[PDB]
Write a protein that binds this ligand. Structure first.
Ligand SMILES: C[C@H](O)[C@H](CCc1cccc2nc(-c3ccc(Cl)cc3)oc12)n1cnc(C(N)=O)c1
Ligand SMILES: [Zn+2]
Length: 349
């Protein structure tokens, strides 16, 4: 039954959007928050979704559970640990998971995320704890894992700490920086704090990726490339509305982090037209298949592979070409990237 019954590579998925329902119950219960339900699947139906909704509808999902996970020191380590385990079942051999350390913080973070009262969990140790849970996960379930840290469009004041956090924990899982949280706000790509952070990223050798084009115009995709100096684009479906941009990214081998199921459940893509990925497919574009938020979207990597092959006619060779490009574009050192490529080359025959 499963679509691509071979090893995979994932470069786009949010930790704070890949938490087991049961683990949220456990913590919400043990802390004093209570969720809109007390049964696993019950909680999985209310904070998840089976049909496309609007932005605020989507955003509300986080409002439910995040206050239950964020703040607790061992809740963060457990979610990271359980994350690696999840990828194992999906058959992923290499995965880059991202997140905003600040949105899990409850100390030294203004404003303080999701209401939440003050405390002592500083952003700095939030990522260190994720590192830990991630590394244990790697050794216990057998998946290679790296972490990307996220900046938030609306809160550019946190950006400097992000790059610093990336440089401080270099190697120890964190290999890149990201920009997330509503590319729709005017001139957000160009906010000084954001551009200075990415400028710092180049100056200290930390890789770069930017959410852009999912629901933003081609221009935001262009700002991400020309100003912030990205190496990869999250989604970036809208770069099609600008041909010299597209034509240029094609010859420059830009990597697109695609999440087809997600683009549906968020409205990014209308079922009326043909997904932006078939166009990429037909143009031999360097892109990857990604889950994004398995919790909110009640999916798994397979969910996305099923869709590409079911309603888009994706063949097993396209899936291989795809994942191999994913490995070339990963933010892995060259030695570990060769090793990774090699693995997939032998296993893809
Ligand atoms: C960067 C983090 O992991 C997050 C934090 C979620 C969040 C917190 C506060 C404000 C936020 N604004 C967004 C947001 C994301 C996309 C658009 Cl087009 C508009 C708003 O997401 C937010 N995350 C997780 N999944 C997504 C996602 N799929 O976009 C974002
Ligand atoms: Zn995303």
């Amino acid at each position: 039954t499963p679509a691509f019954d071979k090893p995979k590579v994932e470069l786009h998925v949010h930790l704070d959007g890949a938490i087991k329902p049961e683990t949220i119950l456990y913590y919400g219960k043990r802390r004093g928050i209570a969720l809109p339900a007390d049964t696993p699947e019950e909680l999985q139906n209310i904070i998840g979704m089976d049909k496309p909704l609007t932005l605020p509808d989507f955003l509300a999902k986080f409002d439910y559970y995040m206050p239950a996970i964020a703040g607790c020191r061992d809740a963060i380590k457990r979610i990271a640990y359980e994350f690696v385990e999840m990828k194992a079942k999906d058959g992923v051999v290499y995965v880059e998971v991202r997140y905003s350390p600040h949105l899990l913080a409850n100390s030294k973070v203004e404003p303080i995320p999701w209401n939440q009262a003050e405390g002592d969990l500083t952003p700095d140790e939030v990522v260190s704890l994720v590192n830990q849970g991630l590394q244990e996960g790697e050794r216990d379930f057998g998946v290679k894992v790296r972490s990307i840290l996220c900046c938030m469009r609306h809160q550019p004041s946190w950006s400097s700490e992000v790059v610093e956090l990336c440089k401080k924990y270099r190697e120890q899982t964190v290999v890149a920086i990201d920009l997330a949280g509503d590319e729709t706000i005017e001139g957000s790509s160009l906010f000084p704090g954001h551009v200075q952070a990415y400028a710092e990223a180049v100056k200290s050798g930390v890789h770069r990726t930017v959410h852009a084009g999912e629901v933003g115009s081609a221009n935001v995709v262009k700002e991400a490339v020309d100003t912030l100096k990205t190496e990869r684009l999250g989604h970036g479906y809208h770069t099609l509305e600008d041909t010299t941009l597209y034509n240029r990214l094609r010859q420059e081998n830009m990597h697109f982090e695609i999440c087809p199921w997600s683009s549906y459940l968020t409205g990014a893509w209308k079922p009326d037209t043909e997904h932006a990925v078939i166009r990429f497919k037909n143009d031999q574009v360097n892109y990857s298949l990604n889950t994004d938020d398995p919790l909110i979207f009640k999916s798994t990597l397979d969910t996305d592979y099923q869709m590409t092959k079911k309603d888009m006619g994706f063949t097993e060779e396209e899936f291989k070409r795809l994942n191999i490009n994913a490995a070339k574009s990963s933010f892995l050192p060259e030695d570990e990237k060769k090793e990774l490529l090699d693995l997939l080359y032998k296993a893809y025959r």
